[PDB]
Design a protein around this ligand. Structure first.
Ligand SMILES: COC(=O)/C(O)=C/C(=O)C1(Cc2ccc(Cl)cc2)CCN(Cc2cccc(Br)c2)CC1
Ligand SMILES: [Cl-]
Ligand SMILES: [Cl-]
Ligand SMILES: [Mn+2]
Ligand SMILES: [Mn+2]
Length: 181
């Protein structure tokens, strides 16, 4: 697993809180992308990770004149264009709901208004994995309808192992315990 080994090498060598903070953030981003790949694989949908909203619009509505609209340049993780409906997808890996709420608010208020002007029926979907319990929580009524079961096989233990080693290595470093938390 060259992903695990790459983090381990960085954790072995890191000496400063700033480089350590970046490793921690990279591990959190990596387990996020791991969940997205596994989810898209299980649902046999196309795997994407951050698509510019303008690019989504051009895929679903090639004839659009971009310059006719105020398109926020957000990059949701992924999308599903059924031909009648656009599900905007964002992955989350978290034990809590705050990150979901924050992103739900953002994409609801920024994406829906312009998609209604353009005329594309859209739903904001956030799929969260709890990295401790592996349970999946979905917001998006149309998504649940399309995918009533999510047969993922998730294992977040290696991400926990790596990040724990990093936190252990900097447990007596005041600068670090500030930056991560
Ligand atoms: C899970 O939901 C998200 O948090 C998410 O997918 C965030 C992202 O994709 C960014 C990379 C990332 C960081 C931490 C984790 Cl754990 C997972 C992914 C990349 C995009 N930025 C938002 C942004 C930044 C600059 C310009 C624009 Br426009 C938009 C946030 C982090
Ligand atoms: Cl360093
Ligand atoms: Cl964004
Ligand atoms: Mn993203
Ligand atoms: Mn995401």
């Amino acid at each position: 697993d060259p992903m695990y080994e790459q983090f381990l090498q960085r954790i072995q060598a890191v000496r400063t809180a700033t480089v350590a903070k970046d490793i921690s953030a990279d591990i959190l981003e990596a387990r996020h992308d791991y969940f997205g790949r596994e989810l898209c694989r299980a649902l046999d949908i196309e795997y994407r990770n951050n698509v510019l909203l303008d690019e989504i619009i051009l895929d679903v509505y090639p004839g659009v004149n971009l310059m006719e609209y105020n398109v926020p340049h957000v990059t949701p993780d992924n999308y599903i264009w059924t031909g009648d409906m656009l599900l905007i997808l964002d992955y989350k890996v978290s034990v809590g709901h705050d990150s979901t709420e924050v992103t739900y608010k953002k994409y609801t208020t920024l994406i829906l208004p312009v998609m209604q002007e353009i005329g594309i029926n859209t739903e904001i979907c956030i799929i969260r994995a709890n990295p401790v319990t592996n349970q999946i929580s979905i917001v998006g009524e149309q998504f649940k309808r399309l995918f009533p079961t999510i047969p993922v096989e998730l294992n977040f233990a290696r991400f926990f192992e790596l990040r724990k080693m990093l936190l252990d290595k900097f447990a007596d470093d005041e600068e670090f315990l500030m930056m991560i938390a």
